[PDB]
Amino acid sequence: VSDLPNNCLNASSLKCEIKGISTYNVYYQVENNGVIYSCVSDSAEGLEKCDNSLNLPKRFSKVPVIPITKLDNKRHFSVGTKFFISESLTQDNYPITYNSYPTNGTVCLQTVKLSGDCKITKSNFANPYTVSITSPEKIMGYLIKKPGENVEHKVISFSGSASITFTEEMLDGEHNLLCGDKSAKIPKTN
């Protein structure tokens, strides 16, 4: 029971400090016996007493996201930010634990986009403004977004299948339905 990564787990038992809050995970370090451990988690549990825990959300959405690498489709696909492990630019890779995985590296904060398999179809059952989204993965996210908006905390998580009926404000020619790695233009009403 080698418990190196465990130090990040009991943080209800240690002096803790949040260093950063992203849309989908938290960046914090904890002290034990004078040694500092860096941690990244997608779970907000037990971090209430940490310093800088003021804006710690109720829970984190667990939808699959990946970094946006082409900067010009940032406005289109952005759904917030997340913390990632990366390599040090000065080779000072320090020990750090990511979602209870021990590793070496540093912390990167990056704007992210939805990802994963999501099937989009137009439904027979209601109307051309009702769509069905399905996914073989445990959790899949979708977001309806006009480019440039800040609707980052409106990612909806679903398991297996869901149905959406577009509102009228969405039925201009500028709203896109983002689901997993997919983007589909939402039609104009008339």
Ligand X SMILES: *[C@@H]1O[C@H](CO)[C@@H](O)[C@H](O)[C@H]1NC(C)=O
Ligand Y SMILES: *[C@@H]1O[C@H](CO)[C@@H](O[C@@H]2O[C@H](CO)[C@@H](O)[C@H](O)[C@H]2NC(C)=O)[C@H](O)[C@H]1NC(C)=O
Residues forming the site for a copy of itself (CB under 8 A): 19-20, 27, 66-67, 69, 71-72, 81, 84-89, 98, 101, 103, 106-111
**Residue number with CB closer to ligand Y (13 or 104):** 104
CB 25 within 8 A of CB 56: no
Residue 72 per-residue DSSP state: G
Out of ligand X, ligand Y, a copy of itself, none, which partner does residue 10 contact, by CB within 5 to 8 A per kind? ligand X
**Residue number with CB closer to a copy of itself (20 or 95):** 20
Out of ligand X, ligand Y, a copy of itself, none, which partner does residue 95 contact, by CB within 5 to 8 A per kind? ligand Y
Residue 169 three-state SS: helix
Which residues form the interface with ligand Y (CB under 6 A)?
A: 95, 102-104
Out of ligand X, a copy of itself, ligand Y, none, which partner does residue 6 contact, by CB within 5 to 8 A per kind? ligand X
CB 20 within 8 A of CB 26: yes
CB 38 within 8 A of CB 95: yes
Nearest approach, Cβ of 144 to ligand X (angstroms)? 38
In order of 4, 15, 17, 37, 174, the CA distances from 34 in angstroms are 15, 10, 14, 10, 54
Nearest approach, Cβ of 10 to ligand X (angstroms)? 3
Which residues form the interface with ligand X (CB under 6 A)?
A: 6, 9-10, 12-13, 46
Out of a copy of itself, ligand Y, ligand X, none, which partner does residue 157 contact, by CB within 5 to 8 A per kind? none
Residue 6 per-residue DSSP state: G
CA–CA gap between residue 28 and residue 5 (Å, rounded): 14
